[model samples]
Target: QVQLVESGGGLVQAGGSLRLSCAASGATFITYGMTWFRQAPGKEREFVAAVTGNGAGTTYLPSVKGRFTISRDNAKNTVYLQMSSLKPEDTAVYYCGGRRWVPATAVDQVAYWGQGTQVTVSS
Candidate 1:
């Protein structure tokens, strides 16, 4: 019974930063990476970044490489994504995902997703 819960406020001002967290239960953080995605109104899902355990490493989507940061808190089995310089267009629902490891391979696949948290950017 694996579960990922997302926590964050719903409103953010333009030019502000938003911090969202995904906490996992019934899983080990060391064996997998957590990924974040953003889905804005009338837009397709966009990959933000992927964070590995230890709160140190991340691989970002090329387009948003400079605006997003993904980190983890091993002590709490939580993964976090922070977005800076938010604008109205940045309003979206953000999701956290857990990767499923394939035996004998380094290519992990997304196996679970958190209930998305919606963020609204306003002035």
Candidate 2:
């Protein structure tokens, strides 16, 4: 029963920051890197970033670089995405991605995902 559970508030005040977490069960954290994705209303999935459990080294998507931070809690086998300077345009559903252990040649393709967490930016 491998699963990823996301926890965070649904509402974030504009100009504030939001921290969302993804907790996984029945899997080893070292074997996979945690990936984040944003799905805007009626739009396709947007890749945010990915971080490894070892040292929080991140690989950001060109479109989201400098605005998103991805981190991991190796001790708890949990990963998190923190977005700063929130805005109404940032409102969307975020998902945590999981991929099986693969070599470098197979990176960027995930086979599993968490039940998405919906977040909204408002007053």
Reference-based TM-score of each model: 0.84, 0.85
Report lDDT (Cα) of residue 19, candidate 2: 85
Q: Which residue pairs of candidate 2 clash?
A: none
Error of 1 at 108 (Å): 11
Counted clashes in each candidate structure: 0, 0
Model 2 weakest lDDT span, ten residues long:
99-108
Evaluate all candidate structures by whole-model CA lDDT and list the values in order.
0.77, 0.78
Report the lDDT tens digits of candidate 2 across residue range 1-123: 788999884887888888899998887767887788878888888777887657346788775677778888888888888888877877899888877553121225876688899989897
Off by over 4 Å in 2: 102-108
